[model samples]
Target: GPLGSFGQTTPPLVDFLKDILRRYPEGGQMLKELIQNAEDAGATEVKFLYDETQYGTETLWSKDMAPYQGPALYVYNNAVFTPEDWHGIQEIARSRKKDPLKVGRFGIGFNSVYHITDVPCIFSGDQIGMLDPHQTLFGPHESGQCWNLKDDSKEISELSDQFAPFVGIFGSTKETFINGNFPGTMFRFPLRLQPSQLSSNLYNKQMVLELFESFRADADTVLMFLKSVQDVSLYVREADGTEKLVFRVTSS
Candidate 1:
């Protein structure tokens, strides 16, 4: 156990993550990171589901805030995470995949989404985790976002408790979001009340939606071109009950 310890020194976790966020083309490259994650998880597809909160449902976020719902996005993959994946996400810049075929071990890309939301939520099987930039007990840590992970195995029928209290916005996935014929992983990202207006944070709703455009705009040159992935597709669902293909590609 003598050589089994590591730690971080920095301007701060938030500062550390911001430093990296600045390194990319803003939030534009986050899709690639997410796609890379999906490929590693063995998903044939990764989805960026964008829809508004149902007009009549509860805000689904906070108890004190008015009943408000806006645009919500969910990243869905058909691959449930293994424990190795869990451990890989717990820290920054580390991966347990030993010389993995399609995996990148630097582990910094996943954190890029933090630039878009203060908190990002993940649901895998019976385990749920939240990365909240607003709270960090480790005064100085390399972890830009402090994650709270646990078992959310019980909830009253009347209560919509998933992982944490949704403020003016809900930022994570709930257990109900994971039960289905195919349960992979879900990462929910909501703009919430992070900007100057109520309609959409920093007008990043479409901006965030656009970040995923790479899956469409560069499906061949940038996406399908990757040797790590075989097939990748993007689907869009509108209120009219129609499906549209935004992007679809397969290796030769």
Candidate 2:
């Protein structure tokens, strides 16, 4: 019918991500999975922040990006993401850790976060990027898995321009940079809600609070099991712009 119309039979990345979601239906286990990664990276501290602020529309890319400005869950670790760590994150089921001592297994472990947010943005090591396998956030792409705010191309620049405003909303600024980038790694998962096509399941303030409670319930056992991480803390930034320490645990 057409000249070489047959395409490769590879599956879309979203299918594999959905498979991961099915494996970890609880979604609260995102805490454990993230802690496992932090420990593997030789981090000593981990912080989980729930932001309830609705940012004003100032420098938005589009009105579509407004929903993401509502509420978010942030996971922070003391260690910066290495180049190898960034590359390793792009893989689905394959893990880079070959050492038996490491607790994280199957590159799919991190994808458990998809249960909470359609887009997971990472700020680390002089870079701010988002994972968009569904190609929904900045769509119309022939193919793309990640979007970096510092990319040079005009197409990427446009996407980056829209996303850069989020940095300020998340509380990062030029003054916060160490050398040229963040001193540590931070993952921001904007709580998914109604109208999201990638995820049918939705999350809200109450559900997120419950999830934090569930995670905190086992923080004791979790700390004992970890090797490097010594402290795990949780905080909430109220809609009024005030921050409150919700819970904390120290291994020592």
* Model 1: per-residue Cα lDDT over 1-252, one tens digit each: 001111333223445565566676455577778888887777766666654443334423344222223344567777788878777675544334533222234377887776555556666654555554333322233333222232232332233433333222222334343332125677766555443111123434466557667456776776544655666655544544354656666775
Query: Taking the tens digit of each residue's C-alpha lDDT, what string does model 2 give over 38-147?
Result: 99999999999888866655455566566566678998888988888876664444324542222123365688888888667777766666676555446755222444
If scored against the real structure, what TM-score would every candidate get? 0.64, 0.78
Q: Give the number of the best model, judged by TM-score.
A: 2
Clashing pairs in 2: none
**Candidate 2 weakest lDDT stretch, 10 residues:** 1-10
Strongest candidate by lDDT: 2
lDDT computed for candidate 1 = 0.51
Residue 249 lDDT (model 2): 95
